Amino acid sequence: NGIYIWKIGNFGMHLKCQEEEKPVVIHSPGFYTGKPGYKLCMRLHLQLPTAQRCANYISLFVHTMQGEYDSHLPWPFQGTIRLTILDQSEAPVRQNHEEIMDAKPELLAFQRPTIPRNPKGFGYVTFMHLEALRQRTFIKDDTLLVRCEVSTL
C-alpha cells in the first residue's frame, strides 16, 4: 500500500505556459508500491485552450515503469489507485479533488513494461478543470500537491 505525494512547484509558470498555448507535460519521479513492489509514476497535462473537448483541464495518468523487482512480481498489475489533488487549507475547511480507479489487468497499461516507462498510461483526461483550482486553496506557495495511493498486495 504505497503513497506518493508529487510536489509540483513553480506552478504559476506552468499555468502561464498553458495560457500561451505552449504544451505542459510533466512526469512525477518514479515511486515504488513497496520494496519489493511495482514502480509507477504519474503524468500530468495542462491541456491547451485549443484542445477540443478537454481544453483547460488537468490530465492525470498513472504509468507503469521498469522496476528493480519486476521479475519477482505478479503480472499484469492489479490494484486500486487513488489520485488526489490536495486542498492545502486547514483540515476544517478542506475538500480534496479525488478519483478512484481500478487497475484492470487486461489493459495494455498494466502489462509488465518492456521499456523504462510504459507509454500507455491510465487515468483522466479531464481530471480537474483549471478554473476549479481557483475555487479552493489548491495552489499554496506556488505548489500543487498530487497524491497517489496504490492499494495492491
Partner: peptide, 12 residues
Amino acid sequence: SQSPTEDDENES
C-alpha cells in the same frame, strides 16, 4: 462517476 481511460503518451 467519471471513467478512467487508457492514454498513449506518444499520441501527442
